[PDB]
Each structure stands twice: as C-alpha cells, then as structure tokens.
Paper text:
The injectisome is a specialized bacterial organelle that utilizes a type III secretion system (T3SS) to translocate effector proteins from the bacterial cytosol directly into a eukaryotic host. Composed of >20 different proteins, the injectisome forms a syringe shaped nanomachine that spans both bacterial membranes and that of the infected host. The major structural unit of the injectisome is the basal body, composed of three highly oligomerized concentric rings spanning the bacterial inner membrane (IM) (PrgH and PrgK in the Salmonella enterica serovar Typhimurium SPI-1 T3SS)3–6 and outer membrane (OM)7 (InvG, a member of the secretin family of OM pores also found in the type II secretion system, type IV pili system, as well as the phage assembly system). To address this and further elucidate the structural basis for injectisome assembly and function, including that of the central needle component, we have conducted here a cryo-EM analysis of the assembled native needle complex resulting in 3D reconstructions of the IM and OM rings at resolutions permitting atomic model building (3.6 Å and 3.9 Å, respectively) and the 3D reconstruction of an isolated helical needle filament at 3.3 Å resolution.
Completing assembly, the helical needle filament—composed of early substrates PrgJ (the rod) and PrgI (the needle)—is secreted in a type III secretion (T3S) dependent manner and polymerizes on the periplasmic face of the export apparatus, extending into the cellular milieu. To further study the atomic details of the needle therefore, we isolated native filaments from assembled needle complexes and subjected them to cryo-EM analysis resulting in a reconstruction with helical averaging to 3.3 Å resolution with excellent density for side chains throughout allowing us to build a de novo model of PrgI lacking only the first two N-terminal residues. The PrgI monomer adopts a helix-turn-helix motif that polymerizes via an extensive network of interactions along both helices with surrounding subunits. The structure supports the solid-state NMR model of PrgI presented by Loquet et al. (Cα RMSD 1.5 Å over 78 residues), which was fundamentally different from prior low resolution cryo-EM derived models; however, some notable differences in the monomeric structure and helical packing, as well as the definition of the majority of side chain positions extend our understanding of the intra-subunit interactions and the internal channel passaged by effectors. The kinked loop in the N-terminal helix (residues 20–23) is more extended and forms a tighter interface with the N-terminus of monomer i + 6 while the C-terminal Arg80 has its side chain and carboxylate flipped, altering the interactions with monomers i −1, i –5, and i – 6.
Author numbering:
A (entry chain Z), B (entry chain T), C (entry chain Y), D (entry chain S), E (entry chain X), F (entry chain d), ...: 3 to 80
Amino acid sequence: TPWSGYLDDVSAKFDTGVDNLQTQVTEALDKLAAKPSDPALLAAYQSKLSEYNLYRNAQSNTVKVFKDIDAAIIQNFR
Amino acid sequence: TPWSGYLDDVSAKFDTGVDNLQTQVTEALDKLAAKPSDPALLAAYQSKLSEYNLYRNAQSNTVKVFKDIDAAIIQNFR
Amino acid sequence: TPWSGYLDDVSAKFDTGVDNLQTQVTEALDKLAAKPSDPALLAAYQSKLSEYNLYRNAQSNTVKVFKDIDAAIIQNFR
Amino acid sequence: TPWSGYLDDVSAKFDTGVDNLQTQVTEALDKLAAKPSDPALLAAYQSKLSEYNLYRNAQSNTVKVFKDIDAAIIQNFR
Amino acid sequence: TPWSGYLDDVSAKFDTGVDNLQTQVTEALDKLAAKPSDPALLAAYQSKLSEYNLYRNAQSNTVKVFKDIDAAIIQNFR
Amino acid sequence: TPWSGYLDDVSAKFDTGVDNLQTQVTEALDKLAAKPSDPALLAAYQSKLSEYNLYRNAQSNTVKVFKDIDAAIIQNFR
Amino acid sequence: TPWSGYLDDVSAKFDTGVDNLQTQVTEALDKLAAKPSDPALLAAYQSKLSEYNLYRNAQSNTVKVFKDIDAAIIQNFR
Amino acid sequence: TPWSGYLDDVSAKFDTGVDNLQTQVTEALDKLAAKPSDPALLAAYQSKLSEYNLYRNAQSNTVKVFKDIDAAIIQNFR
Amino acid sequence: TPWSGYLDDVSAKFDTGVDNLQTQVTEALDKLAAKPSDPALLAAYQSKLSEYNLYRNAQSNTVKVFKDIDAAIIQNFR
Amino acid sequence: TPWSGYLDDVSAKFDTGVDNLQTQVTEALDKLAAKPSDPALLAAYQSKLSEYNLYRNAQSNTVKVFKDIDAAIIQNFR
Amino acid sequence: TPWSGYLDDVSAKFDTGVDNLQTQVTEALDKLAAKPSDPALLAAYQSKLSEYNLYRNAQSNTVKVFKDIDAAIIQNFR
Amino acid sequence: TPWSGYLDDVSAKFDTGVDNLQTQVTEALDKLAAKPSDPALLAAYQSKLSEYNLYRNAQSNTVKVFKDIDAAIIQNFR
Amino acid sequence: TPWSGYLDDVSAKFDTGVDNLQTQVTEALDKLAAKPSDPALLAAYQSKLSEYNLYRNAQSNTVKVFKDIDAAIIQNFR
C-alpha cells in the first residue's frame, strides 16, 4: 500500500477536485496545434490554460502553508 | 461529466448569450462567396462580421480580468 | 453558531460595506452577453468590473497585513 | 438601494453631464433613416454622432486612469 | 486632539504641499462633463489629471519607504 | 483595584502614547469599506494601517526585552 | 492662489507662446460663416485652423512625455 | 539521444501540428519573388504569411505560460 | 559643506556628464512654443526631448542597482 | 553631563559622519511636495532618500553586532 | 578517488538526469548569434534557455532543503 | 589583460556573431543621408536597421536571464 | 605589517580573482555619462554592472557562511 501523509491528502483534494483538467488541457492543445487560427479553438484554449494556471498555484501555496504550521509545532517539542 | 471551472462558466455565458452567431457568420460568408457583388449580401456580411469581432474581443478580455483577480488572491495565501 | 475570528470580521466589513456588488457584476454580465455591442452596456460593465477588481484587492491585502501583525506578537511569547 | 462606488460616480458625471444625448442620437438616426438624402438631416446627424463618439471615449479613458491610481495604492499596503 | 504619527506627517506634507489640487481636479471634471468637445477644456483636464496621478504615486511610495526603514530597526531590538 | 506590574506599565505607555489610534484605524476602515475606490480614502487608510503596524511591533518587542533582563537577574539569586 | 504644477507650467508655455490664437480662430470662423464663398476668407481660415491643429497636438504630446519620465522615477523609490 | 524536456515537447506539438508550413511559406515567397504582380500569388502569400504569423505567436506565448507555472512551484520548495 | 554620499556621486556623474542638457531642453521648448509649426524647430525639439528622456531613465535605474547591492551587504552584518 | 556608553558612541559616529543628511532629506521633501512633477526634484529626492535608507540600516545593524559581542563575554563571568 | 557526499549525489542526479542540456544551450546560442533574425532559431533558443532556467532553480533549491534537514539533526546531538 | 566574466562572454558571442553589422549600419546611414530619396538606399537601410534592432534586443534580454539564474543560486548559499 | 585573518583571505580571493573590475565599472560609467544614448555604450555598461552585482553578492554571502561555521565551533569549547 502506497503511504500518503497529510500533505499528500491536501494535494490529493485538488487532484480529485477537478475531474479531467489534466486531460482537457492536453486535448485542447492537440486540437489547437492542428489548426492554430481557429477562434473557437483559441478561446477554448485560453479558458482551459488559465484554469490550469490557477490550479497549480492554489495547490502549491496551500501545501506551503500547512508545512509552516507543522514546523512551528515540532520546534516547540524540546 | 466534463468539468467546468469558473472561467469556463464566464466564457460560456458569451456562448449561450448569442444564439447562433457562429452559424450566422458562416452562412453569410457562404452566401457572399457565391456572388460577391450583391450589395444586400455585402451589407449583411459587414454587420455579422463586425458583430463577431466584438464578440471574441469582449469574451477574451473578460477572462483575462478574472484571471488576474484570482492570481492576486492566491499569492496572499503564504 | 458559525464561529468567526477577527480576520473573518475584517473581511466581513468589505462584504457588508458593498450592498449587492456581487449581484450587480453578475447582472451586468448577463445583460452584456445578450447583446455585446451596446455602448450603454459596455460602459456600465466597465464601471462595475473595475469596481469589483478594486474590491477584492483591497480586501485580500488588508487580511494579509493583520496576519503579519498577529504573527509578530505570537512569536514573542516564548 | 443600488450601491455605487467611486468609479460609478465618475462615470455618472458624464451621464448627467449630457442631458439627453442618448436620446438625441437615436432620434436623429430615425429621422435620417426615413429620408437619407436630406442635407439638413445629414449635417445634423454628423454633429450628434461625432459628439457621441467623443462622449464615450472621454468617459472610458477617465475610468481607466482612476483604476490605475487605486491599484497602485492598494499594492503598497503589504 | 486627533493623534498623528510620523507617517501621517509625511503624507500630510503632500496634502499641504498642493493647495487645492483635489478641488481643481473635481472642478475641471465638472466643466468637462458639461461639454466634452471643447479643446480648451480637454487640454486643461489632461494637465490636472496627469498632475493628480503623479501626486498619489509619489505620496504612496514615500510612505512605503519610511515603513520599511522603521521595520528594519524594530526588528533589531531583541 | 486591578493590579499592574512593571511590564504592564511599559505596555501602557504605548497605549496612552497614542490618543485614539485604535479608534482611527477602525473608523478609516469603515469609511473605506463603504467606497473602496476613493483615492482620498485609500491614501488615508494606508497611513493609519502602516502606523498601527509599527505600533504593535514596537510594543511587543519592548516587552520581550524587559522580560529577558528580569529573567537574567532572577536566575542569579540562588 | 491657484496652484500650478510642473506639467501645468509646460502646458502654460504653449498658451503664452501664442498671443491670441484662440481668439484668431474664433474670429476667422465668424467672418467665414457670414459669407462662406469668399476666397480671401477661406484661405485665411485654412491657415489659422491648420495652425490651431498643430498647436494642440504639440501641446498634448509634450505633456504625455514628461508624465512618463516622472512615472519612471517614482517607481524606483521603493 | 538528444534530450527533450517538457517545454521542448510543448513546442514540438506546434511543429508536428503543422505538416510543412515552414516549407509552404518559403515556396510561396520564391514564387512571389519571381513575379510580384500576380494576384493569384499575392493572395496565396497573404494567407500563408498570416498563418505563419499566428503560428509563432501562439507557440511562444504557450511556452511562457508553462515556464511561469513551473517557477511558482519550484519557489515553494524551501 | 554639503555632504554627498556614494549614491549622490553616481547621480552627479550624469549631471556633469551632460553640459547644459537641462538648459537646451528648456530653450528649445521656448523657441518651439513661439512658433509651433516650424519643421526646423520640431525636429530640433524631438532630438533634445528624446535625449532628455534617456537621460533620466539611465540615471534613475543606475541608482536603484547600487542601492540593492548595498542593502544585500548590510543585511549580512548580523 | 549626559552619559554616553560605548554603543552610544558607535551610533554617534554615524550621526557625525553625515553632516546634515537629516536636514537634506527634510528640505528635499519640502521642495518636492511643493511641485511633485519636476524631474530635477524627483531625481534629487531619489538620491537623498536612498542615501538615508542605507544610513539607518548600516547604523542599526552595527549596534546589534556589538551588543551580541558584549553579551557573549558577560555570560562567561560566572 | 574524488570524494562525493550526499549533497553531491543529489546535485549529480540533475546533471545525469539531463543528457546534454549544457551542450544544447551553448550550441543553440552559437547558431543564434550567427543569424539573430531567424524565427526557427529564436523559438528553438527560447525553449532551451527556459529549460535551462528551470534546471538550475530546481537543482539549487533541492540542495538547500537537504542542508536544513541535516542541520536540524546535528543540532540535536548535544 | 582585460578581465572578462561569463556575462561578458555571452555578450561577446553576439558581437563576434555578426561580422561588421556596426559598420554596415553606419555606412548605410551615410549613403542614405547623402541622397534620402533613392529607393535602393531606403530599402537597403530598412533591412540593416531592422537587423540591428533585433541584434540589441536579443543581446540585452539574454544577459538579463543569466543574471537571474546566478542570483537565484547565490541566494541559496547561506 | 597589516594583519589579515582567514575571513580577510577569503574576501581577498574575490578581489584578486577579478583583475580590474572595479576599474572597468568606473570607466564604463564615465564613458556612458558622456553620451548616454549610444547603444554600444549601454550594452557594454549592462554587462559590467551586472557582473559587478554578482561579484559583491557572491563575496558577501561566502564570508557569512564561514562566520557561522566558526561560531558553531567556538561555542563548543566550554
């Protein structure tokens, strides 16, 4: 069984919170690269890329906060 | 179920806000290309093309604003 | 009873300080998406969107300041 | 009571600053479309349309300036 | 007696340094909104608005500098 | 009679040293939240918030120093 | 005493640099509108109108340059 | 084996997404330079050059976005 | 004796590096405002204004760099 | 006679090391607040403010070092 | 035999993890400097330079983390 | 021997990468200024000036990137 | 004989490691201040200033590390 800590479970909630955003970004890029002059494909790709940008930034900053909460408590043991 | 974020829902309101503007531009182009010397077809195509031009510009700039609002908040987590 | 801290009460003052700005932005977007070529609707939406932009930026930066004031005091306990 | 911010009040001064310019443009267009070969109607419509053009450009650029003034101050909080 | 700190006194020097710039911007806007096609009023308003823009930017950045000078000294107490 | 130690009297000098800074910060926030796009209100709130930030930091670090002076003397009793 | 900044003084040099160009344009228009078929009046009005056109364009662009010089310096404070 | 990172693979999808656009632009230029007064050659070259213009702009901006996503995560390691 | 630091001496080298550029810009503006339709005066003023623009930008950015070099060293004292 | 310790004498060397830097910063601010759009006044104030910033940081960190040297020796008495 | 610690072995995994990225950046720069107006060479160099930028940042931050883990353990010996 | 760092060697590759582009721009300007109405001289000067424009922009941005790579590593020493 | 410790000898290796970088920065500034619009002088000064910036940062951080190594050993005497 692969072990998962508390910081893993926080980062897992973003991964399960979006259904297939990792799939939808890759598929929208492949349709865009086939014909990069379609306004229907450009506006669709702008939405999914900007959505994926806010996805990783909210994920990585959240893990950073819970790390600093835990490190402040462990220091007060000794 | 295809997942849709908040930026998807903002861009979807422009898509549902016009009924068949993507259809009307394509149909007016096909009637124009059959006979590109009809003043009734030129004036009809000028209206629909200029309407489609303002459609994508208002859509793409609106998504850009809500991205910068969200990125300013996520930065203030840590 | 839902508990509310001091940082909740600071952020609540921005929420009660505007009456229905969350409503007015959504309603102005829906009227704009119905007809995105009306100058009366574009100028109305520019005002409410720029007002909503300054709303969240002043809110999020204010909470960040009071967090750093409190964290400086808690560090000087031990 | 409909809430109005500072940027709303700046844009409202242009709206109250002209009495019925939104009415006068629409009425001059309706008289022009009835008979678009009258020089008295063409010269009247040229004046009101060019007046309405300078109206929206001075309005929209003014709101853009006060937005950038406010965003520079809010950034210097934290 | 309303208390005023050192950062208040720095920001007060910009307020007393201009006599009635807050008045002159508001009065020039009201004369402009009455007739927004007068070149004498546009050129007068461009000067006062750009002057008011440099006013707040020089004020807010100056207060930010003296804050960081003081915070560096207070940290070296303990 | 509420008892007050020496560390209470040091912290009381900051409280009496400012007249109504706790009042002025709260009142400036309430005026800002009513209309968070007024440059006169943003620049006033930047001054009072940054003044309140230096207030608590100078207060809390000063009490920390006098604690460590006293604890060094009490250790040299036995 | 009406306060005048540096950008006011730059724009004032164009106003004092021409003696009565604002008067001469208005007077030449009034003589032209009385009899708009006089070649002596048309050629006189072409000269003064084209002179007034270069007047405002050189004035407004000059103020724009000194604004961008000042804004680049104020940014390098903090 | 030539190593290829993730940013290489994103830029490679635009290169494989078009078949021979780098060839078609060069060949259309060579046919145009032989006889630069043929309307069949001018209209063919306008299409391929404008297509190649949107090709590089969509490619270079996409790589810039994924760089800023990665740099935000690497900063939150320490 | 007026004291001058190292950052004063860096900024003084730009001031002594140009002989009378502050004079030449003011004199070219006064000759331009007397007759703002002379191509010999417009082309002379374009050269001196663009020269003065690069003067302040190179000056202010240079002082900003030496400030950040010094602040990095002073931090490594304690 | 006002008593002065060794840490007073170290901090006094910075005060006597600059002649009138406390005067020059205050005078440059008063000239700037009278006309905050003069590039000669902005560049002069950038130099003196950045000089005053490095002044207090080098002063306060130096006193912190000599405090920690003395506290390490006093601890080794008993 | 050249000795290699644990921090050397962590940094060595980035060096062996890329095959010839140090070679590919240098070769792409030499081809770019020969003709710095080729879009095929600019887009190739943007990819390799941005890849090399993320390479060193992920390497240097990783070594910093394992240093702080080890220093926390060594402190708890005595 | 004149010392040259790594950033000097990167900037030197652009200088040696072009043979005499600094010479060719100056010579094409001198031939153009002798007779600025020759289409053979205008089209030759457009090519060399636009080539020199891309030369300095690619040079200066490349040095900026390697500076930020080095500054990120030096920060992780202490 | 001027005494030199171990920390002096570490800082001396940076000073002897560059031949005349202190000279080359000062000479490039003097040539730049004579004519601050020469692209050959701007690009030369960008290279030497950025080289001098990395020089002091690598020097000052290195001395800080060897200080903390020595202070950890001296503490373990008693």
